[PDB]
Structure formats: structure tokens, C-alpha cells
């Protein structure tokens, strides 16, 4: 692993700790979220992020942070503000960026 891959793995582990239920661990399926794929143009999740770190797809911390923000923004677009997914996405978006400094 390169220094960036080691850093991003550290950030990913710390971000996933903030989602103990694993709501963001895997891609959102159309079975759980009817018509999700039709509403959300660029889906993102922690699992996909791990696959991109392993494949060395992230060339900067800026790119990784963009994917994390995407994941949270998607949940805040699809879900209504009163839901657990929306509330967690908003919470981890701010906490995650703070953590990453
Ligand atoms: C499993 N997590 C889920 C399920 N449904 N929806 C709509 C979501 O946004 C998330 Cl993060």
C-alpha cells in the first residue's frame, strides 16, 4: 500500500466507526429503497469506497472526501429529514470532515 492508501484506510475505519449499524456499509438496493437507482444518479457507500482505496482509484484526500460527501448528500436527497438515514448522514458528514481536519 502507498502512503495515501494507508491514510485513506485509517480515515475509512474511523468513518465506519460512526455508522455502527452499517447503514452506509453497502450500496443501497432498490429492494430496501424503491426506485433509489432512478432518483440517485451517483450512488456511494463505504464498501465502494474501500474497493476504490484497494484499487488505488483515489489520487488525493480531496477525491476521497468528495465520495464521503456524495454518500451523505445522497442519503439527504432521498430520505426525508425526520428519518434515521437522513439524521445519521447529516451527523457523520460534519463529524467526518471534522475528524479528517
Ligand atoms: C441500508 N441503508 C439505507 C437504506 N435505505 N436508504 C433509502 C438509504 O438511504 C440507506 Cl443509507
Domain segments of the chain as ranges: 1-101
Cell numbers at 19, concatenated? 455508522
CA distance 72 to 89: 5
Q: Which residue do the cell numbers 485513506 mark? A: 8
> What b/e sequence results for 45-84 when a residue is b if at least 16 CB atoms lie within 10 Å of its CB, and e otherwise?
bbeebbebbeeeebeeeeebbebbebbbebbbebbeeeee
If one counts every other C-beta atom within 10 angstroms of the C-beta of residue 8, the result is: 25
Please tell me the residue having the least CA distance from ligand 1 atom 5: 33
3-state helix, strand, coil in the chain (%, to 5): 60, 0, 40
CB 89 within 8 A of CB 79: yes
What is the stated resolution of the deposited model, in angstroms?
1.5
- What determination technique applies here? X-ray
For residue 24, the ligand 1 atom closest to its alpha carbon is: 11
Cell numbers at 40, concatenated? 440517485
Nearest to 9 by CA among 62, 46, 38, 44: 46
Contacts of 5 (CB under 8 A, 6+ apart): 53, 54, 56, 58
Cell numbers at 79, concatenated? 430520505
Probe residue for ligand 1, chosen from 22, 23, 24, 30 as the CB with the greatest number of ligand atoms within 8 Å: 23
Amino acid at each position: 500500500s502507498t502512503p495515501i492508501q494507508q491514510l485513506l484506510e485509517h480515515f475509512l475505519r474511523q468513518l465506519q466507526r460512526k455508522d455502527p449499524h452499517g447503514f452506509f456499509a453497502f450500496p443501497v438496493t432498490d429492494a430496501i429503497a424503491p426506485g433509489y437507482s432512478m432518483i440517485i444518479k451517483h450512488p456511494m457507500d463505504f464498501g465502494t469506497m474501500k474497493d476504490k482505496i484497494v484499487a488505488n482509484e483515489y489520487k488525493s484526500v480531496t477525491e476521497f472526501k468528495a465520495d464521503f460527501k456524495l454518500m451523505c448528500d445522497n442519503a439527504m436527497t432521498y430520505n426525508r429529514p425526520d428519518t434515521v438515514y437522513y439524521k445519521l448522514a447529516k451527523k457523520i458528514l460534519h463529524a467526518g470532515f471534522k475528524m479528517m481536519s
